[PDB]
Ligand binder design. Structure first.
Ligand SMILES: [Ca+2]
Ligand SMILES: [Ca+2]
Ligand SMILES: [Ca+2]
Ligand SMILES: [Ca+2]
Ligand SMILES: [Ca+2]
Length: 415
């Protein structure tokens, strides 16, 4: 139930989760969710240190009986083992070793090239159509999924390997439309695309949210179009976040060769101000899209696009909306939200407005308040430096949330 911190290993440059959509009658009537797993590794690795984790929506994890996939270049599948939490229950995350030689998926020496784990099967105890019809309204809450590399030595997520998103259903009618009428302009250029959403306290004056969409290249694509054939970048932000957003910007996201993507925020990389409507959708174009997207022309580098959400209030005001306080103004741990997920999506359209093949990348941002002290887990780990599973880190009777916003005293000192 508790979230994980982040660590830094640039060698795990990309890790994309590519699942099938769930709208066609063939997929809707099957008990198996198919997927491929793409990875790019910039340096050699070995041993049992690093793992591959796959966190699934609890609606689906309730029905999962087996998860498996073929390692890169193999015919024999490997089974994902379900994870057990601290006390012994089963999480909604399955885990497999990374290095192929240690019952994993990818070879420790296959670097500087895209490698795929194919024939991935999420075997369920029921057909997906039955679960979709017994899951509720999937127009706001989606069937979230997440994949990342885990450093088992420090129990942290490798920052550059995180990728999230959600499975497409018929409730996502707009997105499902574009993956059925794909454009013909460059159906060969790109392999797959996934997104990732994180919280960043250095953005603006109240913190920010970073949406980093990567698009893997099949070859060495180069973007050169006439002014009348210029593409457009289309984005959709979760409507549940608009009250808290001061503004949205488009940043450059350069794949810096062997170093991959720089995950840090840099306000100097802003290239445009994005406009959005009431439902959270928007689009942007130019007479030369090379101004707004670092396509890494003529190079086999992954294409990246960064969207920044500058908040107008502190991020802790999201789960603490319609919460209750006492006479002294302190938060009662039993009134604030504990979990809430937000969904985003980004994709490229051609001149007529059709999707470029495998350019749709969805992302989910999982905000969590495990100890329910009013401070998000990401806030405590990245800014306040307090224990994410303790209402009172220093042990002086003053809760962590009350100590930071109310008492204005350090939540780390008790004497
Ligand atoms: Ca570059
Ligand atoms: Ca907390
Ligand atoms: Ca805490
Ligand atoms: Ca305290
Ligand atoms: Ca204190």
């Amino acid at each position: 139930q508790k979230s994980l911190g982040y660590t830094d290993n640039y060698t795990f440059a990309s890790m994309l989760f590519d699942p099938g959509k769930l709208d066609s009658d063939d997929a809707l009537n099957s008990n198996i969710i198919p997927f491929d797993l793409h990875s790019y590794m910039s340096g050699a690795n070995s041993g049992n240190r690093y793992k591959i984790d796959l966190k699934l929506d609890p609606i689906i994890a309730e029905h999962v009986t087996k998860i498996s996939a073929n390692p890169s270049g193999s015919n024999k599948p490997v089974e994902f083992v379900r994870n057990k939490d601290e006390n012994g229950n089963l999480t909604d995350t399955w885990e497999v070793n990374f290095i192929r030689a240690n019952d994993g998926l990818f070879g420790g020496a296959e670097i500087l090239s895209q490698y795929t784990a194919k024939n991935g099967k999420i075997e369920l105890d029921d057909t997906v159509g039955n679960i979709i019809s017994n899951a509720g309204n999937l127009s706001n809450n989606k069937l979230n999924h997440q994949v990342f590399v885990r450093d088992s030595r420090e129990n942290k997520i490798v920052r550059t390997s995180e990728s999230s998103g959600y499975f497409l259903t018929k409730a996502d009618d707009d997105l499902v439309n574009l993956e059925n009428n794909v454009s013909t302009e460059n159906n060969n250029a790109f392999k797959a695309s996934s997104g990732s959403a994180t919280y960043n306290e250095n953005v603006g004056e109240f913190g920010g949210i970073l949406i980093d969409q990567q698009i893997m290249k099949n070859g060495i694509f180069s973007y050169s179009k006439t002014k009348a054939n210029q593409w457009a970048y289309n984005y959709q932000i979760d409507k549940d976040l608009l009250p808290y957003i001061e503004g949205v910007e488009l940043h450059q996201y350069d794949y810096k060769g062997l170093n991959g993507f720089d995950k840090n925020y840099d306000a100097k990389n802003k290239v445009a101000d994005l406009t959005i409507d009431e439902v959270g959708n928007g689009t942007i174009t130019s007479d030369n899209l090379n101004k707004l997207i670092e396509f890494n022309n003529a190079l086999p580098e992954t294409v990246g696009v960064r969207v920044v959400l500058k908040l107008n209030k502190s991020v802790n005001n999201i789960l603490t909306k319609d919460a209750k306080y006492d006479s002294e103004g302190n938060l009662i741990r039993e009134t604030t939200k504990q979990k809430e997920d937000f969904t985003f999506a980004g994709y490229l359209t051609d001149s007529k407005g059709a999707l470029i093949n495998n350019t749709l990348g969805t992302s989910t941002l999982a905000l969590q308040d495990y100890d329910k002290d009013g401070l998000l887990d990401r806030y405590e780990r990245q800014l306040s430096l307090s224990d994410a599973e303790n209402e009172d880190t220093d042990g002086d009777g003053k809760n962590d949330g009350d100590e930071v916003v109310n008492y204005k005293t350090s939540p780390l000192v008790g004497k």
